[PDB]
């Protein structure tokens, strides 16, 4: 239940790595937080994981893609 | 990509189905549902294991299915929330 608030979600992105290629608020926005290695985020709803983020990628694009049948992806949809 | 399968090469449905080959006989689903939930024959008892997720099922019991089990067991596999 901690991780239900996008605000709590922004908190996990301490020590989030300056290399990476989308902001804590982007991820939290979209359901994620970050699990505490390397740039991988997951999903406070579904439980899916994503990591290896590249230039361009879009935090909401992914998750749908990958984990179509989450609540919270298919609520935004 | 920003998900990646635990074993690739049983990415594919048909190379999870031969890996049945010596499936035992007293394992009562059959390797078409097991393959089509993700899953292969590790080689060991009646364990098998999603290529995806990379998650592991054994000691089956009556009236299991696979899609259940691997939903109940793993239910943030990407193979699970693609289905
Ligand atoms: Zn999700
Ligand atoms: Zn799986």
Sequence with gaps: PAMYSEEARLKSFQNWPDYAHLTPRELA?????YTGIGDQ???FACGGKLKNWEPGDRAWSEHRRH???????????
Excluded: D, I, M
């Design 29 to 33: 926005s979209a359901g994620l937080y």
């Design 41 to 43: 985020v997951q999903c």
């Design 67 to 77: 984990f179509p049948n989450c609540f919270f992806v298919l609520g935004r949809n």
